Amino acid sequence: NPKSLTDPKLLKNIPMWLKSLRLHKYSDALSGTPWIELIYLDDETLEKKGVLALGARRKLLKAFGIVIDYKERDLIDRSAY
RNA sequence: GGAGGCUCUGGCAGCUUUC
After folding, report:
1. Is the sign of the CA dihedral A61, A50, A22, A15 positive or negative?
2. Are A46 and A60 in contact (CB under 8 A)?
3. In Å, what is the separation between the CA of A33 and the C1' of B3?
4. Whole-number Å distance between alpha carbons of A40 and A22
5. Among A37, A65, A77, A80, which is most exposed with the fewest C-beta within 10 angstroms?
6. Which residues contact A81 (CB under 8 A, 6 or more apart)?
7. The domain spanning residue A60 has which CATH number?
8. Domain range for residue A37?
9. A6 three-class SS
10. Would you call A18 exposed, middle or buried from its count of C-beta atoms within 10 A (0-12, 13-18, 19+)?
11. What is the separation of C-alpha A61 from the centre of its chain, rounded to a whole number of angstroms?
């Protein structure tokens, strides 16, 4: 879902970004922190913070991996930051 | 086959009571 996941407006709004994934369940906890630093969180940190669901950690890990890949590629519009 | 329930493994998932 790179069309909406890579969208800078969605990335700028962590809540909407989570709503796009459909895991808003963690949006109440993950929100409040930018995806730029959030992508730097490890699975153990995410587990310690919350989102115990391993599946959610796996999907979120893959999504964050793709986001990190896009961030490394730099194909994201500077509008994101 | 129909229906209800529970675990997250995050879905046309598994287990299970029942007709």
Report:
1. negative
2. yes
3. 44
4. 21
5. A37
6. A36
7. 1.10.150.50
8. 1-81
9. coil
10. buried
11. 8
> What is the C-alpha to C-alpha distance for residues A12 and A35, in angstroms, rounded to an integer?
8
CB atoms within 10 A of CB A75: 10
Using DSSP's 3-state secondary structure scheme, residue A12 falls into helix
Nearest nucleotide (C1') to alpha carbon of A57 = B10
Strand B bases with any atom < 7 A from protein Cβ: 8-11
Cα–Cα distance for residue pair A34/A59, rounded to 1 Å: 19
Half-sphere exposure of A33 (CA within 13 A, CB side): 14
| Alpha-carbon gap, residue A1 to A9, rounded angstroms | 14
Overall domain count for chain A: 1
- The first and second tokens of residue A12, run together, are 């700028």
